[PDB]
Design a protein around this ligand. Structure first.
Ligand SMILES: O=P(O)(O)O[C@H]1[C@H](OP(=O)(O)O)[C@@H](OP(=O)(O)O)[C@H](OP(=O)(O)O)[C@@H](OP(=O)(O)O)[C@H]1OP(=O)(O)O
Ligand SMILES: O=P(O)(O)O[C@H]1[C@H](OP(=O)(O)O)[C@@H](OP(=O)(O)O)[C@H](OP(=O)(O)O)[C@@H](OP(=O)(O)O)[C@H]1OP(=O)(O)O
Lengths: 221, 221, 221, 221, 221, 74
C-alpha cells in the first residue's frame, strides 16, 4: 500500500497480516466461491501490486487455479504491450513507461509502481489494472467450479421453491451469464425446472410474475 | 468511506474486512432477522455506495432475497429519475447531476459519488439515499420470513405469558405493522391468543393493563 | 458519537460494531443481569442518542423488556415536556429548543442532537439524559427477573454461608433496595434465613458482627 | 480516563470494553487469585475513579467480597476526612477541596475528579489514592481464600519438592506475610513439612541452602 | 522496525506480539510449507534485523532447520566480507562500514542498523539484505520437506486430474524448479504420470493443451 | 412445442433435432443473445448422450457446420 507524508514524499506502508489471512481463509473455506472476487478487491483497495502478489502466493493450495490466473495475467499482459507503444530510448532521469509486467511488480519495484501510480504528468495506476486481470482468472475458476449448471438445477418431490431459487440464482451469477439471458432464464427456466404442483400455483399468479409473488404464492405447495 | 485531509482534498478510505464479515455473519446466522436492517446502517454509517455494494455482494447465499433488494432499488430508482429532471446538456467541467444508478455507484465511480456527497453548491449525499432503499428490500424479506403471523402466536398448556409476549412483539415489529394497530393488538390480541387460566388473571387486573402489570400478575399462572 | 476537528466543526463519528455486539452479548447471556445497566453506560459514554437507539434495536430478543423500556422513556418524556416550557415561535435561524423525543433522536437528527449537546449559549446534553431514562427501564426488568426474593434466600442442610451471602447480596442490589433497609437486612435477615448450626457460631461472635468476621467464623460450620 | 488536547482543555476519554471484560474474566476464573490485585492496577493505570467504579460494578458475582471492599473504602475514607481538615467555607469559584467520597467519584463528577487530579496549585490525584484502597479489600479476600495455610502445605508419599514448594510460596504471598517471617519460613518450614527421604537429601546440601540447590538436589528423590 | 519523527530523529519502534505469533503459527502448523517464505517477508516488511532475529528465535521447534538457516546466513555472510573491502582504519566519529554480521544485528545494535539503513551519504539497508539470506535457508528446507518428488506424483484408479494437478504444481514450486523445465514438466509429465482413461481424453484435445482445457475435458473421466 | 422441451430422440439424428429446434427458436421470437447461448448449449444438453459426447469431443464453442459433420452417423 501507499501512505503520503507532510514535508516528506509518498512512502510504502506494508500489507497487514489479518488481511493476508482472510483472503487465504476465503479461498480455502469457500473453495473459490464467487464472493472470493469482491473479498479480494475490498481487502486490496489501495494495495500496490508487490503486495497483491504476496497475498496470492501465501495460498499454496488450489495452486492449479492460481496457475490459471497467472496464465490469464500474461495473456492480458501481451495485449497492453501491443496496444501501448515504446516512445523509444527514454532519457536517463525518467522512470521507464509502464509495461504489463511492471504493473504486476515482478520485474519492477514497489517504489517505481508507486511513482507511476502517482506521477503528476500522467499518473498510471499500476495497482488497479492488475487486480482487474486477477479477477478474470478468479471468475473463470468459479465458473469451472459451478458443480450444477442452471439447466440442471431443478425441484425434487421434497425440495421447495425457496431453496431451489437460491441454488438457481447463485449458479446464474457464478456462470458469469449476461443480463438479457438472465431475465429469460429468470422468468422461464425457474418455472420449467420445478415440481408440477408448485408450477401450477406459480402459473396461477398470471404472466411475468415477480420473485416476491412467486415466493409468497408457493408457500407450503 | 470518505476521509478528509488538511492541505489536501477529500480521499476515499476503503471499507474494513471485519465489517464486511460481520454483515455476512448477521445474515447467515440470524437468517435475515429484522435486526439485520440496523446492523447494516451502523456498519455502513459513512460508507460510500461502491462499498455498500461490495458488502452485499460478498454474501453469496440468501441470493434470492438479495435479488429482491436489487429489484426494489431499481423501482425506487425509476421514481427519482421521474421526479428529478435533466437540466439539459450540462457544460463540460461539471460532474453530471446525480441519477438513481450513480447513487448506487454502478455506472458512477466513488470519486464522483464523493464529489456530489460533498459538492459545496448543492451537496447530494449519494451515500445515505441508497442505504434507505436497501433497507426496504431487507425489511420486506424479514416480513416474508416471519414464520408465525401475530394472529397465530398463542399460548399452549405449558407455554407461559413471558415467552408468548416475546414471540408476539418480535413478530409485530417484523410484520412492519403500523402504530395504532400496534396498540390495539397490544391491548387485545395479546389476551385473546392466550391460556384461559392466565387470561382470567390478566383480566382481574382491570382495564387497559400495562405490560409491567400483565407480566407481574401472570407469574406462575 | 461526536469527534471535534481543528479548523473544522464538530463531526459525528459512528458507533463501533464490537460495542453493538458486546451489549447484545451482555443481554442475551446474562439474561438482563443487573450489570447490564453499567455495561450499557460504559459502552455508551459519549454516544449520541441515534446510536444508543441503534444498539438497543439490534437486540430482537427479550423484546417485551425493550418495549417496557420504551414505555418508561415516553412517561419520563411527558414530565420534561410539562416542566420545560415553549419560549413561543422561535425565530428561524435558531434550532428548536430540545424536547423529550429529540433527546431520543427519533424525530430529531444526530446533527441537531450534537448542536444542543455543544451549543455555547446553553449546551443541553441530549446524550446523557436519555441513557438515564433507559437505565430505569433496564433496572425495573432486573427487578422483574430476581428469581428469588431476599426473604426467600435461605440455607439448606448442605448450603454454606459464603454461597448463601452471595445469593443474598446479589438479589439485594437487583431489588433496587434502599440503604437503611440494606443495613437492617444485612445485619439481621442474613442470620435469620440460615442453618442453625452456623447461626449459633455467627451469634457467638457478639453483636453487629462485620461480614469479614461472619465469613471467617462460619468456615466449615 | 483523561486525555489532554492542544488549544483545548483536558477531556475525559471513556474506559474501554475489552478492559472492563478482562477484569471480570480475571475474577470469575482466578476466583480472586492474588494476581487479581496487579491485573486491576495495570488495567486501571490512568482511569479516573468513576470508571474504576463502573468496572468493579459490572461484576455481579463474588458480590460478598465486593461489599467487603466497599466497607474497607469507607473505613479508609473516615481516616482521610479526620486527618485532612476543612479550610472553612471555600469561596464560590473554587472547587471543594477533595474528601474520601469525591476520591471515589460517588458524590463527585469525573470533571471535578480530573480538576483536582490536574489542578496546578495543588494537584490531588483522586485516581491513584482510591485504587490503593480497593487493593486492600482485594488483598484481604485473597487471604480469606488461601484454601491451605502454609503450615498445612506438606509433602505426601508421591508429592515431589517442586510442586510442594510452588504450593508453599503461592500461599506465602497470598497470606500477605511479612519479609523476615518469609525468610525463616523459606529456610525452615519448607524442609519441616516434607517427605523424609527428600528431607535427608535437602539436609545433605549443608546449611542455609539456596532454592536453586534445594530444587536441583531433590531431583528424583 | 523504524518510525521517523518531526523535529526529532528516527526512532526504533518495537516488533508486535501478534506478528511474532503468526510467524510461529505459520511454521508449527504448515510444517515449513513453501508459503512460510512470503508470510515471513510480509510480516517483516520494515523490521530491522534485531527484530527478525527475535521472531525466528521464539520458535524453539523445527530447530534443526533454523540451524540450517543459520549456517546459510554465515556462508552468504563470508561472500559479502570478501566482495566488500575495508576502507582501512575509519576515523572516529564515523559508524563502521557494515559487515555480514552487523546486517544480522548480532554484534551490531539496532540504532547502528537504522543509521546505515538511512545514512544519507550511502544508505545501506541492513534490513532487506538479511531477510533475503533467511529466505534461501527457508527455501532449502521446503525442498528438503517435499514428501513427494514431482516424478512420483501420479494418478491412482480413483484419483482425478484436479487433485493430482494440485499435488503436482504445489511440489513443482517447492522443489524450487527453473522455468523452462517447469513448462516441459507442465506440458508432458502431467500427462505421463496419470490414469490412462483420462490420458486418452487429455490427448483427444490436440497438442500443447492449456490447463483450462485439460481440466474441463477430464471432468468425470 | 417449446425449445426447453425439444429433445433429440434416442434413435433420431441430432440433425432432425436441429431442424425441430431452430424452427422453434425463431417462432418464440427469442432475443439474439439468448439465441447464441441456447444454440451453443441447449442443443447439446437436450440431445442423445452418444452424439452429445461426440459434439463434446468436437471441442469448445463448436460451429453447427462441424457439429453436423461430426454427429453424421452418430
Ligand atoms: O476483541 P476484538 O478486538 O474484537 O478481537 C478479536 C478477539 O476478541 P475477544 O477476545 O473478545 O474474543 C481477540 O481480541 P483481543 O482480546 O486480542 O483484543 C483476538 O482473538 P484471536 O487472537 O483469537 O484472533 C482478536 O483480536 P486481536 O487482533 O486484538 O488479537 C480477534 O479475534 P476474532 O476475530 O477471532 O474474534
Ligand atoms: O486495526 P485498526 O483498524 O487500525 O484499528 C485501531 C488499531 O486496532 P488494533 O489494536 O486492533 O490493532 C489500534 O492498534 P494499536 O495501536 O493498539 O496497535 C488500536 O489502538 P488502541 O488499542 O491503543 O486504542 C485502535 O483502538 P480503538 O479501536 O480503541 O481506537 C484501533 O482503532 P479503530 O478500530 O477505531 O481503527
Amino acid at each position: 500500500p501507499v501512505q503520503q507524508t507532510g514535508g516528506g514524499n509518498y512512502i510504502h506502508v506494508p500489507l497487514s497480516p489479518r488481511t493476508l489471512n482472510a483472503w487465504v481463509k476465503l479461498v480455502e473455506d469457500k473453495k473459490f466461491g464467487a464472493e472470493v472476487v469482491p473479498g479480494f478487491q475490498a481487502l486490496s483497495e489501495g494495495c500496490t501490486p508487490y503486495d497483491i502478489n504476496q497475498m496470492l502466493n501465501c495460498v499454496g493450495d488450489h495452486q492449479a487455479a492460481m496457475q490459471i490466473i497467472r496464465e490469464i495475467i500474461n495473456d492480458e499482459a501481451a495485449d497492453w504491450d501491443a496496444q501501448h507503444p515504446i516512445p523509444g530510448p527514454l532519457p536517463a532521469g525518467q522512470l521507464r513507461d509502464p509495461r504489463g509486467s511492471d504493473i504486476a511488480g515482478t520485474t519492477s519495484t514497489v517504489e517505481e509502481q508507486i511513482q507511476w501510480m502517482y506521477r503528476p504528468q500522467n499518473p498510471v495506476p499500476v495497482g488497479n489494472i492488475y487486480r482487474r486481470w486477477i479477477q478474470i482468472g478468479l471468475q473463470k475458476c468459479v465458473r469451472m467450479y459451478n458443480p450444477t449448471n442452471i439447466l440442471d438445477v431443478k425441484q425434487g418431490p421434497k425440495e421447495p421453491f425457496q431453496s431451489y431459487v437460491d441454488r438457481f440464482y447463485k449458479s446464474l451469477r457464478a456462470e458469469q451469464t449476461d443480463p438479457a439471458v438472465k431475465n429469460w432464464m429468470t422468468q422461464t427456466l425457474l418455472i420449467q425446472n420445478a415440481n408440477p404442483d408448485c408450477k401450477l400455483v406459480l402459473k396461477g399468479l398470471g404472466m411475468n410474475p415477480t420473485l416476491e409473488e412467486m415466493l409468497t404464492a408457493c408457500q407450503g405447495v
